[PDB]
């Protein structure tokens, strides 16, 4: 249950 | 336990490998350590592989089909030393993927192509060994075909390497700044899971099996035992000479497996249990193996020197600009005629054997 990748989180 | 990176983001500390340093993942010095390893590797890998490529092209005598395949291997290693290692080094000292997602892609693709191409080339070598042992009939074989074959291996290599570029899986390695196929998540849109099983088995595993199988067939035929002189369990010097080539090829394969196998195994295990820890799922483990795979690039030139006198003597001829090849020469065909080189020993139109021209040489 890995957390989903956040596009916004990426700088 | 996991975040996009291998470390947990219990703290908000985790940051994208693209954006910032990954210092939290491992000690900063460890970063310099990996950078150091890469820098030294660049020197060795470049020099050794260039020497191999240079020597065989330079020395007219070393024109065997096998030599063609070896150049291919050498070339694959060269790309590693020039292309992949350089980027991996930059990152390491930066502590992350400064280049960003596009480059992760570029950097993963070329290195992946290199690994696939190597194992596949090794298989061709195995098959050719099998062919040489059973059917010595020289005519069923062509140099031109070898080039075609080499190109083919690259094509297949692209079949795995390129699709990740096509909408497929993607991503950076544990501490990393090395990029590889997406074992961690099953990024659904991406269809990661399918790609993972497919790639490992088809590209790495199957070719490994074939090489292993072809190796077994060779077992009945020429084996390790080879008496140094032609006489004794050898039926002709050429026959006795060949056994030397096979053994090196065997060692080349062995070193290859040892270097890569751990990575491939770890490749799969995290696929089955992602988001968990293997013995320990960490930055360290994934990292150690992938960087270790990189070391392979250096090993082949060493094996050649130790493994075969012909290269050893011929190389030395190259190193000293002039001949200066004391030490007993090849004491065989440094070249068929005598010494071999671009010039020097390798005399134009090396001698022919048999009334007809047995080997396609002296054409």
From Swiss-Prot, chain A:
Mod. after translation: The substance P form is cleaved at Pro-2 by the prolyl endopeptidase FAP (seprase) activity (in vitro). Substance P is also cleaved and degraded by Angiotensin-converting enzyme (ACE) and neprilysin (MME).
Residue(s) at site: Cleavage: 2-3, 6-10
Residue(s) carrying Methionine amide: 11
Transmembrane annotation, as ranges: none
Protein's recorded name: Substance P
Species of origin: Homo sapiens (Human)
Residues of the full protein shown: 58 to 68 of 129
From Swiss-Prot, chain B:
TM helices/strands, residue ranges: 31-53, 64-85, 106-127, 148-168, 194-218, 248-269, 283-307
The protein's name: Substance-P receptor
Subunit structure: Interacts with ARRB1.
Keywords (A to Z) from UniProt: Cell membrane, Disulfide bond, G-protein coupled receptor, Glycoprotein, Lipoprotein, Membrane, Palmitate, Receptor, Transducer, Transmembrane, Transmembrane helix
A cellular-component GO term for this protein: postsynaptic membrane
Residue ranges annotated as Cytoplasmic topological domain: 54-63, 128-147, 219-247
InterPro entries membership: GPCR_Rhodpsn, GPCR_Rhodpsn_7TM, Neurokn_rcpt, NK1_rcpt
SUPFAM superfamilies: Family A G protein-coupled receptor-like
């Amino acid at each position: 249950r890995p957390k989903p990748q956040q596009f916004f989180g990426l700088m | 336990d996991n975040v996009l990176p291998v470390d947990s983001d219990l703290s908000p500390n985790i940051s994208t490998n693209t954006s910032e340093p990954n210092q939290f993942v491992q000690p900063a010095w460890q970063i310099v350590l990996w950078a150091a390893a890469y820098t030294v590797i660049v020197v060795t890998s470049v020099v050794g592989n260039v020497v191999v490529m240079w020597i065989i092209l330079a020395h007219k005598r070393m024109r065997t089909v096998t030599n063609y395949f070896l150049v291919n291997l050498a070339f694959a290693e060269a790309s590693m030393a020039a292309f992949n290692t350089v980027v991996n080094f930059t990152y390491a000292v930066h502590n992350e993927w400064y280049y960003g997602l596009f480059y992760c892609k570029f950097h993963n693709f070329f290195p992946i192509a290199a690994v696939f191409a190597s194992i596949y080339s090794m298989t061709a070598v195995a098959f050719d060994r099998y062919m040489a042992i059973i059917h010595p009939l020289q005519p069923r074989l062509s140099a031109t075909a070898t080039k075609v074959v080499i190109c083919v291996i690259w094509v297949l290599a692209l079949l795995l390497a390129f699709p990740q570029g096509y909408y497929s899986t993607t991503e950076t390695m544990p501490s990393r700044v090395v990029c590889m196929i997406e074992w961690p998540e099953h990024p659904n849109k991406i269809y990661e899971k399918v790609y993972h099983i497919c790639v490992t088995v088809l590209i790495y595993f199957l070719p490994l099996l074939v090489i292993g199988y072809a190796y077994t067939v060779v077992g009945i035929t020429l084996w390790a035992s080879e008496i140094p002189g032609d006489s004794s369990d050898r039926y002709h010097e050429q026959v006795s000479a060949k056994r030397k080539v096979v053994k090196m090829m065997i060692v080349v394969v062995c070193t290859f497996a040892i270097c890569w196998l751990p990575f491939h195994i770890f490749f799969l295990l995290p696929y089955i249990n992602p988001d968990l820890y293997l013995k320990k799922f960490i930055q360290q483990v994934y990292l150690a193996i992938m960087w270790l795979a990189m070391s392979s690039t250096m090993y082949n030139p060493i094996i050649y020197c130790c493994l075969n006198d012909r290269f050893r003597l011929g190389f030395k001829h190259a190193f000293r600009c002039c001949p200066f090849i004391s030490a007993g020469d090849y004491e065989g065909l440094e070249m068929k005629s005598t010494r071999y080189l671009q010039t020097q020993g390798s005399v134009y139109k090396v001698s022919r054997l048999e009334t007809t021209i047995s080997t396609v040489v002296g054409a």
